[PDB]
Write a protein that binds this ligand. Structure first.
Ligand code: MET
Ligand SMILES: [Cl-]
Ligand SMILES: [Cl-]
Ligand SMILES: [Fe+3]
Length: 178
């Protein structure tokens, strides 16, 4: 299924699991109900994978490239790192397919609590426009992720608070409107 839990309030290293024992799991249905989508895919065949190309069609993901997140490959690693884990939203959907390595994507639930989602090689997610999230690598310190977008991309992150944007209002309507 998926590896996801309500993460702890603990401060300290973000790249740690922040996964309390005992703790409450999180499933697919719950994430779906938050507008979040998920897929498992053959990460070796990505360069010519029908399933990937089917999803892209169905979702008009016309745009794609790859980011390799690690100290020696990504320029301004430490700054970029800090930016990702800042809580923010987007005015469009955020689509990552992890091709290699792994990391965590946290989102807030219907009661504004942090959910942590562990993403591995082969895992793909979509975080709907308007959802407050953040991202961090785990202690392996490496994530390679195909980024996807509907047409030409706009990367802008608006940190929290950003509750005035229409995308934010639309998403919060969507939650109440189940
Ligand atoms: C340069 S901030 C980019 C935000 C990105 N979608 C993330 O959640 O990590
Ligand atoms: Cl990014
Ligand atoms: Cl650097
Ligand atoms: Fe983001």
């Amino acid at each position: 299924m998926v590896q996801a839990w309500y993460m702890d309030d603990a401060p300290g290293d973000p790249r740690q699991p922040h996964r309390p024992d005992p703790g409450r799991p999180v499933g697919l249905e719950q994430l779906r109900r938050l507008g979040v989508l998920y897929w498992k895919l053959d990460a070796d065949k990505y360069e010519n994978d029908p399933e990937l190309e089917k999803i892209r069609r169905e979702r008009n993901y016309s745009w794609m490239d790859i980011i390799t997140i690690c100290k020696d490959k990504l320029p301004n690693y430490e700054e970029k790192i800090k930016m990702f884990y800042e809580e923010h939203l987007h005015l469009d959907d955020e689509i990552r397919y992890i091709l290699d390595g792994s990391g965590y994507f946290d989102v807030r639930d219907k009661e504004d609590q942090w959910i942590r989602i562990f993403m591995e090689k082969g895992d793909m997610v979509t975080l709907p426009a308007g959802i407050y999230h953040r991202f961090t690598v785990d202690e392996k310190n490496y994530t390679k992720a195909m980024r996807l977008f509907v047409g030409e991309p706009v990367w802008t992150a608006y940190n929290r608070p950003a509750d005035h944007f229409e995308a934010r209002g639309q998403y919060v309507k969507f939650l109440a409107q189940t």
